[PDB]
Amino acid sequence: VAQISPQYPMFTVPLPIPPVKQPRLTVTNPVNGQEIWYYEVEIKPFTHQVYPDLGSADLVGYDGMSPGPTFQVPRGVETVVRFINNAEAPNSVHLHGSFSRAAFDGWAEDITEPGSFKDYYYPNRQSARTLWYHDHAMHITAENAYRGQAGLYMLTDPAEDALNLPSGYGEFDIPMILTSKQYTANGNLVTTNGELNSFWGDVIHVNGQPWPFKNVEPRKYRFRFLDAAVSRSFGLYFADTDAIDTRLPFKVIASDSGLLEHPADTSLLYISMAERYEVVFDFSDYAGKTIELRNLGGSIGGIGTDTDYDNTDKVMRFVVADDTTQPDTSVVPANLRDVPFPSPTTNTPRQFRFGRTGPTWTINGVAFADVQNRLLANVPVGTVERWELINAGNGWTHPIHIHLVDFKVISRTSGNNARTVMPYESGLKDVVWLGRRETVVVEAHYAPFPGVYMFHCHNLIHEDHDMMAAFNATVLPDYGYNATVFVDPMEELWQARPYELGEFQAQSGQFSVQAVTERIQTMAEYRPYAAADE
Numbered sequence: 001v002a003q004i005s006p007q008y009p010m011f012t013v014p015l016p017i018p019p020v021k022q023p024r025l026t027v028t029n030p031v032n033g034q035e036i037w038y039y040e041v042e043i044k045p046f047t048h049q050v051y052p053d054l055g056s057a058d059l060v061g062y063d064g065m066s067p068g069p070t071f072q073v074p075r076g077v078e079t080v081v082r083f084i085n086n087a088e089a090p091n092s093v094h095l096h097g098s099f100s101r102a103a104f105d106g107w108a109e110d111i112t113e114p115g116s117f118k119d120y121y122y123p124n125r126q127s128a129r130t131l132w133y134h135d136h137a138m139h140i141t142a143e144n145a146y147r148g149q150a151g152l153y154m155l156t157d158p159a160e161d162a163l164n165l166p167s168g169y170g171e172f173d174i175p176m177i178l179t180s181k182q183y184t185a186n187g188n189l190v191t192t193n194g195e196l197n198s199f200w201g202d203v204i205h206v207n208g209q210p211w212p213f214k215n216v217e218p219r220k221y222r223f224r225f226l227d228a229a230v231s232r233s234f235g236l237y238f239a240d241t242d243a244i245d246t247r248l249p250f251k252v253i254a255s256d257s258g259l260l261e262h263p264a265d266t267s268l269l270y271i272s273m274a275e276r277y278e279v280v281f282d283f284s285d286y287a288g289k290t291i292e293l294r295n296l297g298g299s300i301g302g303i304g305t306d307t308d309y310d311n312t313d314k315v316m317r318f319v320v321a322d323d324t325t326q327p328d329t330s331v332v333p334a335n336l337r338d339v340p341f342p343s344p345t346t347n348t349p350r351q352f353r354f355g356r357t358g359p360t361w362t363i364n365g366v367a368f369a370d371v372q373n374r375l376l377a378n379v380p381v382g383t384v385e386r387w388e389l390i391n392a393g394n395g396w397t398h399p400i401h402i403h404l405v406d407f408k409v410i411s412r413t414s415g416n417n418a419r420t421v422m423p424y425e426s427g428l429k430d431v432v433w434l435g436r437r438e439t440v441v442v443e444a445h446y447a448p449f450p451g452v453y454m455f456h457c458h459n460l461i462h463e464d465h466d467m468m469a470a471f472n473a474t475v476l477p478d479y480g481y482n483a484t485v486f487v488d489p490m491e492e493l494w495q496a497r498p499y500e501l502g503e504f505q506a507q508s509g510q511f512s513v514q515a516v517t518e519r520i521q522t523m524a525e526y527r528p529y530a531a532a533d534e
């Protein structure tokens with residue numbers, strides 16, 4: 001249907017690459033002698049000329065950019081991020097794909113108001129994967145993410161570097177953060193505030209930039225795909241501008257939780273809100289050609305209900321040079337890793353129905369705000385459980401995200417006979433798309449930390465009002481590991497704290513080297529992640 005947003009100079013701006021986020025300093029952990037990387041991120045408003053000939057867009061973003069700066073953290077190193085709210089609305093940051101403790105996981109009610117900050121303590125022990133950090137505050141997640149609070153967080157492993165995949169952030173390892181938004185006639189953003197069904201958007205962005213291009217060499221590149229849209233699911237494929245309907249083959253090497261066992265040969269990649277898929281595409285056969293990254297119409301080939309606009313078929317253009325400056329020395333191994341699948345269970349699965357109770361998106365008839373009823377499962381730490389995630393509807397789709405765990409996709413049924421499990425769903429994931437009349441069974445090890453965590457639809461509109469619930473990963477009184485201060489997300493010890501803007505800008509008071517050091521060392525003494533020492 002007709003584009004609403006003003007006309008855009010398609011494919012004339014280079015793909016922006018988000019700068020790497022650098023820690024301010026390191027703090028010696030008095031428990032294990034090791035350095036903790038400490039960072040400071042300031043949430044704050046800014047403007048961006050999106051359309052060159054019109055007014056500007058009002059955004060609010062981590063370090064006043066969008067997308068957020070990219071974190072690059074090696075397994076083994078613990079990090080503390082101080083997220084400082086200097087905006088006009090509260091925040092709650094969730095590091096998606098990290099088994100953070102409940103109070104550092106971005107619980108929706110665990111907000112930081114403007115004029116406050118919170119110290120997030122992260123383990124970085126899991127399999128190398130593409131995480132992302134984004135807002136998760138109650139009722140306002142959609143608008144906070146839409147206005148720029150999402151960013152990449154790369155967890156790296158020397159062991160994976162030996163696979164010799166295309167490499168170098170910004171070089172031959174390119175982030176591909178997808179979003180879909182709408183613009184007023186003067187090039188400002190059309191707000192999500194008030195939308196209750198779904199906010200599709202008619203302008204496709206990669207890394208913050210509408211319909212860009214990138215000059216690439218005829219060799220192999222690693223693409224880290226993130227669907228950071230509020231509501232738009234994609235069906236991604238590559239095509240020569242000479243043969244715009246003819247899909248070029250590629251390899252999917254990683255899902256949400258890391259590498260697959262083996263590259264999945266693919267020419268169409270379904271990707272819904274909050275899914276990460278890492279792709280290697282070889283441009284060597286297309287020297288001198290232009291390859292368009294494109295999006296499937298017909299509501300993602302009838303899997304979805306998403307509205308399609310004039311140019312939502314288009315994502316970006318790669319302009320391929322005649323030669324490489326240097327030889328492509330990278331490979332894509334047949335065998336990537338041994339995926340740590342959970343031990344199968346024959347325990348009878350729990351059922352969760354993603355539907356509508358009146359005007360409200362619900363889980364098993366319950367809305368997240370209904371505190372009395374929103375705790376839908378107690379699961380003893382260490383248990384494997386199967387959860388049957390059921391979309392009965394033909395008029396909505398739901399990418400379901402379960403915090404804490406990595407899970408395996410066991411099965412998919414479709415009431416429209418559309419599909420079952422995809423080859424790129426062969427690995428470990430933390431989000432799964434319930435397409436039209438789809439029911440999916442997933443299997444997860446509820447481990448290794450006790451605490452109350454969220455699960456929900458990752459359609460941010462549906463998520464806000466109000467398709468979100470909670471599980472408690474429980475332990476018995478004899479357990480230890482300081483679990484008493486770490487199962488309640490609202491725990492006082494970990495709550496946001498006020499700051500004066502002058503302290504922060506001068507790096508004094510609470511922000512002195514000495515005070516940061518006192519704070520981190522104290523946090524580290526509680527030993528948040530001891531139970532995952534092997």
Ligand SMILES: *[C@@H]1O[C@H](CO)[C@@H](O[C@@H]2O[C@H](CO)[C@@H](O[C@@H]3O[C@H](CO[C@H]4O[C@H](CO)[C@@H](O)[C@H](O)[C@@H]4O)[C@@H](O)[C@H](O[C@H]4O[C@H](CO)[C@@H](O)[C@H](O)[C@@H]4O)[C@@H]3O)[C@H](O)[C@H]2NC(C)=O)[C@H](O)[C@H]1NC(C)=O
Nearest residue numbers: 375450451452472473474475476477479482483484485487
């Ligand atoms: C998510 O799941 C977690 C478990 O992983 C739940 O947390 C547990 O909740 C129970 C109930 O609150 C806790 O048990 C209670 O402990 C409290 C204090 O215990 C300590 O201090 C007392 C003195 O005050 C000592 O005697 C004791 O040994 C401990 O050192 C008390 O409030 C409770 O005592 C009363 O209830 C029991 C129940 O039978 C009686 O036996 C007692 O005599 C007494 O009448 C109780 O023992 C447990 O400690 C919690 N665990 C952790 C790790 O925090 C979460 O509550 C759950 N969350 C949600 C939202 O459901």
Ligand SMILES: *[C@@H]1O[C@H](CO)[C@@H](O[C@@H]2O[C@H](CO)[C@@H](O[C@@H]3O[C@H](CO)[C@@H](O)[C@H](O)[C@@H]3O)[C@H](O)[C@H]2NC(C)=O)[C@H](O)[C@H]1NC(C)=O
Nearest residue numbers: 030031480481482483485521522523524525526527528530
């Ligand atoms: C659970 O968390 C608590 C609280 O942080 C841990 O107890 C604390 O352990 C640290 C050691 O890491 C103690 O440090 C102490 O410093 C003082 C100097 O003032 C010194 O006198 C002591 O010899 C020691 O080095 C700290 O006192 C202690 N805090 C309390 C309140 O006991 C505890 O280890 C954690 N338990 C687990 C299993 O993780």
Ligand SMILES: [Cl-]
Nearest residue numbers: 015016017018
């Ligand atoms: Cl750039």
Ligand SMILES: [Cu+2]
Nearest residue numbers: 094096134274
């Ligand atoms: Cu998320």
Ligand SMILES: [Cu+2]
Nearest residue numbers: 095096097403
């Ligand atoms: Cu998450």
Ligand SMILES: [Cu+2]
Nearest residue numbers: 398457459462
């Ligand atoms: Cu949904």
Ligand SMILES: [Cu+2]
Nearest residue numbers: 094136401454
């Ligand atoms: Cu979440």
Ligand code: NA
Nearest residue numbers: 021022063069
């Ligand atoms: Na920065």
Ligand code: NA
Nearest residue numbers: 044045086087
């Ligand atoms: Na401000």
Ligand code: NA
Nearest residue numbers: 282283284285
């Ligand atoms: Na070739």
Ligand code: NA
Nearest residue numbers: 404405406447
């Ligand atoms: Na886990």
Ligand code: NA
Nearest residue numbers: 522523525526
């Ligand atoms: Na302490």
